[PDB]
């Protein structure tokens, strides 16, 4: 059931090979950052993740705190989905909303 | 100024006796070791330090490698303090990188 | 001692979290890569070790062989960091035989 | 057929009789299992399967996740081929592109 620092290894690890796209989009979203050239996950636990984010010249590493805790391993795939497909709708949604002076 | 078996069990018995505190800390960061009921060193080398941890009732050996070898035996008390502070500060971000879902 | 899938996931974490541009290095000189942005490690066993590389074009998949099998486990950190002075002194000789025709 | 457990024995049934090396597969690549003597697919859900794996020492239970729920309207048998033939492929990417120290 509960989040080993080894089980937030392979998830991270996981994501980082087949999904490099959803952390690039996490950090984007959820992290505000722009010009985002690429991301990786580094630690995962209930309360949040470590992503390393690349701008077009340099790298920081940020958090991002969850609105729910993170109950079971098990679910931690199809909730990082969810929060994947939940950045995209409210990136299109932002985009959307430009105005100008 | 080699480090030797006899310094080795000097090292362990002053961390253990006096730094205790510290040795979680190695296990819980550095070792990933999660609900622990007690944390000693065994051994110090200089590329080294082996700790067992009790767990869960259950105990192991789990060992943690030195970024850099200990010079000398005079090294051994500055480095596991100046380890001992390493380890509070990771997870740590500049606050500029913490986010919300 | 043994090379474990679980000690290459370590290995790897700690090399991308604390030696990043050492990987960018090894891609640059070992891996014949000139365009590096970045790069991280994926796999690591007694006989090479697994890239990700990025560069502006995209990413790639290479592996590098070691010239001497790892004995062990404890060993691939002193080999990591040897072989990135080898490949930050490459550029060597020249430096002073520049010649002119 | 959606996934009963009635419907994951007869899956289970005719892989370890007829896929003994695939399930075996599973175990060593996903799994992270060395010195594996045989291995069993116990059960198979939508998200995943159970595994008894074991060692020349004893046995353990892992359970490797599915990347995508399973639908039914797929069938599963050719899931499983699928993921034998991924796992072969797995390192193959990076090995394809060989550099020497
Ligand atoms: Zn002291
Ligand atoms: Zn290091
Ligand atoms: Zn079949
Ligand atoms: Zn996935």
Do not use: W
């Amino acid at each position: 059931d509960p989040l080993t620092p080894a089980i937030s290894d392979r998830i991270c690890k996981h994501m980082n090979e087949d999904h490099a796209s959803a952390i690039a989009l996490y950090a984007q979203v959820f992290g505000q950052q722009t010009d985002v050239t690429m991301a990786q996950m580094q630690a995962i636990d209930p309360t949040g993740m470590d992503l390393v984010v690349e701008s077009e010249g340099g790298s920081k590493t940020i958090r991002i705190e969850f609105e729910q805790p993170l109950k079971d391993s098990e679910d931690a795939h199809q909730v990082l989905i969810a929060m994947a497909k939940q950045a995209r709708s409210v990136g299109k949604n932002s985009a959307e909303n430009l105005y100008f002076q």
